[PDB]
Design a protein around this ligand. Structure first.
Ligand SMILES: CCCCCCCC(=O)OC[C@H](COP(=O)(O)O[C@@H]1[C@H](O)[C@H](O)[C@@H](OP(=O)(O)O)[C@H](OP(=O)(O)O)[C@H]1O)OC(=O)CCCCCCC
Ligand SMILES: CCCCCCCCCCCC(=O)OC[C@H](COP(=O)(O)OCC[N+](C)(C)C)OC(=O)CCCCCCCCCCC
Ligand SMILES: CC(C)CCC[C@@H](C)[C@H]1CC[C@H]2[C@@H]3CC=C4C[C@@H](O)CC[C@]4(C)[C@H]3CC[C@]12C
Ligand SMILES: *[C@@H]1O[C@H](CO)[C@@H](O)[C@H](O)[C@H]1NC(C)=O
Lengths: 86, 804
C-alpha cells in the first residue's frame, strides 16, 4: 500500500520487478533510481504518476467502469449550447 | 589546355563607374583574384549545386551563335543581342542598354590597385549602376585561396565568360558564341586569340549567384570533353548533350557534421568510375621498431625519420618554457654528476673522478643533442654504472690489473658489440618490452630516487645529530670534522621549503589565479623560482653551516700521478696482459646489457603515444651514439654513460604543454639538452655561483622530480586504486572491463615483481637486476595468459591505453 518493489520472475540475467506507489502519492514527473551497496546512484528511467479513479483507496475513485471511461477516458465530448427550449 | 577568363560587371570606388573586371582565370586549374589585387593559389574547381542547376536551366533555353563570322566584341555583341531579341530572350527596348554594358572598358589586375577597388553592381535602365538588393555573399574562393600564364600553349585558343546583373530583365539569359576564326579582342589583355564567348546576363534572383554561374560555365569550358564537343557542335542540342554527360559524371558531396579523410577517400572508386564514364564517349583519353632485413636498415630509417625535423628542432626552443627546463635539468643533471663523481673518486682512488664525469657528460650530451634521434633523453652516470665501476676496480686490484686500461678494452669491445647489434637491427627486440616491464622499471627507479634523497637527508642528520652541547671550535676544512648546531634542522627546513614551493607553483600553473599566461609563465619557472628563494634564504642565514655544491678546481685529471688525459691500451706502468684484452668482452657484455636496457626502456617511456610526441624517436641511432660515445670515452679515461630514466622523464615533463588535464604538445627540440650539457661542462668555471647553492634545496628538487615522475604510470594509479574504493575508481578500460579483484591481482603480481627487484638491488649481486627485469617479459607473455584472459591483458597491459 506504500512504495514497494518485489521480484516476481527472475532468470540468471534479469529481474521482473513489480513496483507499487501509495494511493495518496504526489502526482507528477518521477525519477526512478537504483542504489546498489558499494555503488553510486543509477537512474533507471522516468515515469509520470497520475490520479487513479480505478483504485478503491484513491480520493478520485469512481464506482462505475462506464463512468470511468466516460468521465476520464473519452476524448470525444459534447458541450451543450443554445437555449433551454432549444 | 586552354585559357578561360571570367569577367564580372562591377562598379569601381573612385568614380562609381561600372566596368568589367576579371574575377577568375582557368588553365585547367583555376586561379581567383583577391581584393588585394593579387591572384590566389591555383586549385581544382568546385561548383555549388545551385550554380549547375541554374546553368543547365539557362543553357536549355540558351542562345548559340556557332561559326559566327565576327572578329570584334562590338561585332559579336551586335549579333548576340540581335538573336537575343529574335529568340524573345530580351526585349528590343533592352538592346540599347545591354549593348552599352557589353562594349565597356574591360579592366584587369593591373589596375585594381590603381583604381579604388571594385564593388558588385547591377545594371539599371539608367546608366548609373544599382546597388544589389539581395544579400551579398563573399566569394568562398576568395576567402579560402586569395587571402594571403606560361602554362598557356602557343596554339591554344581562349574563352571569355562575361557575367552581369541587370534589374530590367525578366529572367537570366545565356549566350554562347563560337567564332568562325579565333580573334583577339580588347577584353582580354593576354596575347591569346578568343574562340568562345559565354555571356550570362539577368536579374537578381534567389539561388542564383552570377559569380558561381560564371565559375560553372568556365569550369565546363575548361573540361576537355565538353571543349572538344564545343568545337565540333553544329547545334545547341549537341552542347546540351555534352552538358548532360558533364552533370552525369559529376559527384555531389552532401554536408556532414563529421568530415574525415578516410571517409572522403572512400569515394576514390566513385571518382575514377565517373571520370572513366566521362571519357568513354569523347575521342580524348584521360591524362620505428620494425625489422627490414637490410644491414643498418634501422639506423638509416632512424636518421630519415628525424633528421628532416632539424630546422624545427632549433626554432621550437624559442619559448620561456625551454629556458625554465634548461635551468631545471642543469641542476638535475649536475648534482648527480658531482655526487657520482665524488663516489667514483673515493672508490677508484681518484683514477676516475668528478672532472672526468663532468667533461664526459658535457661532451656526450652535446653530441647526443646534435645527432640523436630523440634529443629529449638526458645522458649521464647512473647507479648500476657506479656498481660496475666498483666491481671492476675490485677485480683489477685483485689480480694486479690496471683499472683504466681494462676500461679502455671494455669500451673497445663495446664499440664492436654496438656495431654488431645495430648492423643486425637488434633494437627490434625492444618491441617485446610491453607496458608491464616499462612501468615496473619506471616505478622502481622513481622509488629508488626518492629513497636515496631521503637517505641523504638522514645521513645529514646522522653527521650532525641534535644534542644538548656542541664543540664550537671545530675545524671547517674540508668538511665538518664533528657535529654542528642547526645544520640538520636547517637542511630539513630548506628541503621542505623548496619542495613545498615547487608543488605550490605547480598547482599555481593549473590554478585559476592571475593572468593565465603570466600564471603559465610563473608556473613554468616554478622550480627555478623555488631554488632561488631557498638559496636566498640560506644566503641570509650566515652563521649556520649547510653543505654546498663543490666543483673541481679546474679541467684537470682527478689524479695527476696515476694517468693522463689519454690512456695507452698496452699499459701505463706495467704491460697489460694479452688474456684480458680478450676477457674484457664479458664485462663489456654486462655493461652493454645495462646501458641497452636503461636507454631503450627510457626511450620507450618518454616516447609513449600518450605523451603526444609527433617528431618520432629512434631506437637504433640513440643506442649506437650512446654506446659508441661511451666506448670512445673509455679510451680517454672517462665514464660510459646511459640515458637515465628520472632525468629524461623530468626533461620531457618540463617541455610538455598542458591543455584545457590532457597533454597537448611537447616542445621537442635539440637546444635544451645542448644547453644543459654546455652548462654542465661550464660548471667548473661557475664555482662562485654554485658554491652558494645548498644541497638541501637540490634534495627538495629531487623529491619533486620523484613524485612528479609517477604521473603517467598506470601501476602507480592501480596501487592507489588498492587504497581507493571501487565506486570511486575512474572510468578507464581496465576498471570498466576488468573485475576489481582481477585488476588488484594484476597489481599484486606487479608489486611482487617490484619487491623482488628491490631485494635484488639490495644484495651485492645488484648487477643482475637487468636480467631479473628481463624475466618480467616471459612473465607477461607466458604466465599471465595462464591466469588472465586476453581481454583482461589487453585492457590492463595496453600499449596506447585502448579498450581492446
Ligand atoms: C598579476 C596581475 C596583477 C593584477 C593587475 C590588475 C589587472 C588584472 O590583471 O586584472 C584585469 C585582467 C582582466 O583581463 P581579462 O579578463 O581579459 O584576462 C583574462 C585572464 O588573463 C585569464 O587568466 C585568462 O584565462 P586563462 O587563465 O588564460 O585560462 C582569460 O582568457 P580566457 O582563457 O578566459 O580566454 C583572460 O581573458 O586580469 C584578469 O583576468 C583578472 C585577474 C587579476 C589578476 C590579479 C592577480 C594578483
Ligand atoms: C618533506 C621533507 C622531509 C620530511 C621528513 C622528515 C625526516 C627528518 C629526518 C628524521 C630521521 C633521521 O634522519 O633521524 C636519524 C638521526 C640520526 O641518528 P644517530 O643516532 O645520530 O644516527 C646514527 C648513525 N651515526 C652513528 C653515524 C651517527 O636521528 C637523530 O638525530 C634524531 C633527531 C631526529 C629529528 C627529526 C626531525 C623532525 C622530523 C619530523 C618532521 C615532520
Ligand atoms: C673488439 C676489439 C676489442 C678487438 C678485439 C681484440 C683482439 C682481437 C686484438 C685487437 C688488437 C690486437 C693486438 C694488436 C697488436 C699486438 C702487438 C703484437 O706484438 C702482439 C699482439 C697484439 C697485442 C694484438 C693482440 C690481439 C688484439 C688485442
Ligand atoms: C692517486 O694515485 C696515487 C698512486 O697511484 C695514490 O697514491 C693517491 O692516493 C691517489 N690520489 C687520491 C686522491 O686518491
Amino acid at each position: 500500500k506504500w512504495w514497494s518493489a518485489v521480484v516476481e520472475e527472475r532468470d540468471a540475467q534479469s529481474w521482473t520487478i513489480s513496483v507499487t506507489t501509495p494511493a495518496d502519492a504526489v502526482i507528477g514527473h518521477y525519477s526512478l533510481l537504483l542504489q546498489v551497496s558499494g555503488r553510486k546512484q543509477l537512474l533507471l528511467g522516468q515515469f509520470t504518476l497520475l490520479f487513479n479513479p480505478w483504485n478503491r483507496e484513491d480520493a478520485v475513485f469512481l464506482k462505475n467502469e462506464a463512468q470511468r471511461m466516460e468521465y476520464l477516458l473519452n476524448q470525444n465530448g459534447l458541450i451543450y449550447l443554445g437555449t433551454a427550449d432549444c | 589546355k586552354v585559357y578561360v577568363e571570367l569577367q564580372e560587371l562591377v562598379m569601381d570606388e573612385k568614380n562609381q563607374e561600372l566596368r568589367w573586371m576579371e574575377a577568375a582565370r582557368w588553365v585547367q586549374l583555376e586561379e581567383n583574384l583577391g581584393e588585394n589585387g593579387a591572384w590566389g593559389r591555383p586549385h581544382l574547381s568546385h561548383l555549388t549545386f545551385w550554380s549547375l542547376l541554374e546553368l543547365r536551366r539557362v543553357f536549355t533555353k540558351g542562345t548559340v551563335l556557332l561559326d559566327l563570322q565576327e572578329t570584334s566584341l562590338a561585332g559579336v555583341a551586335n549579333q548576340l543581342l540581335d538573336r537575343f531579341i529574335f529568340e524573345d530572350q530580351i526585349r528590343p527596348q533592352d538592346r540599347e542598354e545591354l549593348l552599352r554594358a557589353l562594349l565597356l572598358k574591360h579592366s584587369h589586375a593591373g589596375e585594381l590597385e590603381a583604381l579604388g577597388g571594385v564593388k558588385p553592381a547591377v545594371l539599371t535602365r539608367s546608366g548609373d549602376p544599382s546597388q544589389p538588393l539581395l544579400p551579398q555573399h563573399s566569394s568562398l574562393e576568395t576567402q579560402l585561396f586569395c587571402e594571403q600564364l606560361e602554362k598557356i600553349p602557343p596554339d591554344s585558343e581562349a574563352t571569355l565568360v562575361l557575367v552581369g546583373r541587370a534589374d530590367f530583365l525578366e529572367q537570366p539569359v545565356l549566350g554562347f558564341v563560337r567564332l568562325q576564326e579565333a580573334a583577339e579582342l580588347e577584353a582580354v589583355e593576354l596575347p591569346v586569340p578568343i574562340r568562345f564567348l559565354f555571356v550570362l546576363l539577368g536579374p537578381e534572383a534567389p539561388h542564383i549567384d552570377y559569380t558561381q554561374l560564371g565559375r560553372a560555365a568556365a569550369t565546363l569550358m575548361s573540361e576537355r570533353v565538353f571543349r572538344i564537343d564545343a568545337y565540333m557542335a553544329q547545334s545547341r542540342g549537341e552542347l546540351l548533350h555534352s552538358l548532360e554527360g558533364f552533370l552525369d559524371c559529376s559527384l555531389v558531396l552532401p554536408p556532414t557534421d563529421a568530415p574525415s579523410e578516410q571517409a572522403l577517400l572512400s569515394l576514390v572508386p566513385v571518382q575514377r568510375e565517373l571520370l572513366r564514364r566521362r571519357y568513354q564517349s569523347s575521342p580524348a583519353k584521360p591524362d620505428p621498431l620494425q625489422q627490414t632485413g637490410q644491414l643498418f636498415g634501422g639506423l638509416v630509417r632512424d636518421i630519415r625519420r628525424r633528421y628532416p625535423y632539424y630546422l624545427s628542432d632549433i626554432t621550437d626552443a624559442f619559448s620561456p618554457q625551454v629556458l625554465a627546463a634548461v635551468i631545471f635539468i642543469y641542476f638535475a643533471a649536475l648534482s648527480p654528476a658531482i655526487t657520482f663523481g665524488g663516489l667514483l673518486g673515493e672508490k677508484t682512488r681518484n683514477q676516475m673522478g668528478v672532472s672526468e664525469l663532468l667533461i664526459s657528460t658535457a661532451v656526450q650530451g652535446i653530441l647526443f643533442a646534435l645527432l640523436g634521434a630523440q634529443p629529449l633523453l638526458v645522458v649521464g652516470f647512473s647507479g648500476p654504472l657506479l656498481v660496475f665501476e666498483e666491481a671492476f676496480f675490485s677485480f683489477c686490484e685483485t689480480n694486479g690489473l690496471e683499472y683504466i686500461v681494462g676500461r679502455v678494452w671494455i669500451g673497445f669491445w663495446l664499440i664492436l658489440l654496438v656495431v654488431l647489434v645495430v648492423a643486425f637491427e637488434g633494437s627490434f627486440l625492444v618491441r617485446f618490452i610491453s607496458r608491464y616491464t616499462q612501468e615496473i622499471f619506471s616505478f622502481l627507479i622513481s622509488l629508488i630516487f626518492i629513497y636515496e634523497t631521503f637517505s641523504k637527508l638522514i645521513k645529514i642528520f646522522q653527521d650532525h645529530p641534535l644534542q644538548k652541547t656542541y664543540n664550537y671550535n671545530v675545524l671547517m676544512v674540508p668538511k665538518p670534522q664533528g657535529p654542528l648546531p642547526n645544520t640538520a634542522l636547517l637542511s630539513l627546513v630548506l628541503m621542505a621549503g623548496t619542495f613545498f614551493f615547487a608543488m605550490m607553483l605547480r598547482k599555481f600553473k593549473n590554478s585559476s589565479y592571475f593572468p593565465g599566461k603570466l600564471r603559465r609563465v610563473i608556473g613554468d619557472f616554478g622550480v627555478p623560482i623555488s631554488i632561488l628563494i631557498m638559496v636566498l634564504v640560506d644566503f641570509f642565514i650566515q652563521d649556520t653551516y649547510t653543505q654546498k655544491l663543490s666543483v673541481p678546481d679546474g679541467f684537470k685529471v682527478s689524479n695527476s700521478s696515476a694517468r693522463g688525459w689519454v690512456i695507452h691500451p698496452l699499459g701505463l706502468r706495467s704491460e697489460f696482459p694479452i688474456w684480458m684484452m680478450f676477457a674484457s668482452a664479458l664485462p663489456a657484455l654486462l655493461v652493454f646489457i645495462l646501458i641497452f636496457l636503461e636507454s631503450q626502456i627510457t626511450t620507450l617511456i618518454v616516447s609513449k603515444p600518450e605523451r603526444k610526441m609527433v617528431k618520432g624517436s629512434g631506437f637504433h641511432l640513440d643506442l649506437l651514439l650512446v654506446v659508441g660515445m661511451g666506448g670512445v670515452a673509455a679510451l680517454f679515461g672517462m665514464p660510459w654513460l646511459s640515458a637515465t630514466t628520472v632525468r629524461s622523464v623530468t626533461h620531457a615533463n618540463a617541455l610538455t604543454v598542458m591543455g584545457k588535464a590532457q597533454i597537448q604538445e611537447v616542445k621537442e627540440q635539440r637546444i635544451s639538452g645542448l644547453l644543459v650539457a654546455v652548462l654542465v661542462g661550464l660548471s667548473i668555471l661557475m664555482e662562485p655561483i654554485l658554491s652558494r647553492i645548498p644541497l638541501a634545496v637540490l634534495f627538495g628538487i629531487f623529491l619533486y622530480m620523484g613524485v612528479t615522475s609517477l604521473s603517467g604510470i598506470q601501476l602507480f594509479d592501480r596501487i592507489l586504486l588498492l587504497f581507493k574504493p571501487p565506486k570511486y575508481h575512474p572510468d578507464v578500460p581496465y576498471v570498466k572491463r576488468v573485475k576489481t579483484w582481477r585488476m588488484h591481482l594484476f597489481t599484486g603480481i606487479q608489486i611482487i615483481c617490484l619487491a623482488v627487484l628491490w631485494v635484488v638491488k639490495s644484495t651485492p649481486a645488484s648487477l643482475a637486476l637487468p636480467f631479473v627485469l628481463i624475466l618480467t617479459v616471459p612473465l607477461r607473455r607466458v604466465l599471465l595468459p595462464l591466469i588472465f584472459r586476453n581481454v583482461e591483458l589487453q585492457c590492463l597491459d595496453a600499449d596506447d591505453a585502448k579498450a581492446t
